Amino acid sequence: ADLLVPLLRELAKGRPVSRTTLAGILDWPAERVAAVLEQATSTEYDKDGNIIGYGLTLRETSYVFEIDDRRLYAWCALDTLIFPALIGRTARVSSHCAATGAPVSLTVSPSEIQAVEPAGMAVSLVLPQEAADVRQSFCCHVHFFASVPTAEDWASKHQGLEGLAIVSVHEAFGLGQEFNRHLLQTMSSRTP
């Protein structure tokens, strides 16, 4: 009697999943499934109203995310992925340096990386702001840099923005892997 979030499990398959199937898969009544979508109106439907799943962007960006046998796209180095460890397979990630334009690519696996090119690429992130208008406020703004010198080089001429910080794709996986514990919390955060 357990549940490892079959929703995304069947989702990763990228196949038409109806409520009777989500229900049939969850071995739960179509009403329980319904209750779930009853609060998910923002979710994208397809055809008669089935769960389309993911998609990120309508294929028109630079950040590419390949997994198993499904080519995905993103608006930032992050949007490409979300939970590699939850997938249970490898995820090929491709990016381009915002300064050198070099073709960067990394392999995101459920345990670590297995294809870093170039061997020394760097990632870029932004600092949290709480004094900006309403629209997005840099929902992501996550880019990659061919390396730390370029990341830091291009970074030098990329100051003034809302913080903006550079990092090693190696440390980016630890900061990205730690977010889980942060999101896992239902509410509040007692520790610091």
Swiss-Prot record:
Function: Cleaves the carbon-mercury bond of organomercurials such as phenylmercuric acetate. One product is Hg(2+), which is subsequently detoxified by the mercuric reductase.
Family the entry assigns: Belongs to the MerB family.
Protein name per its UniProtKB record: Alkylmercury lyase
Record NCBIfam families: lyase_MerB, PRK13239.1
GO molecular function: alkylmercury lyase activity
Main enzyme class: lyase
Biological process annotations from GO: response to mercury ion
Highest taxon, organism lineage: Bacteria
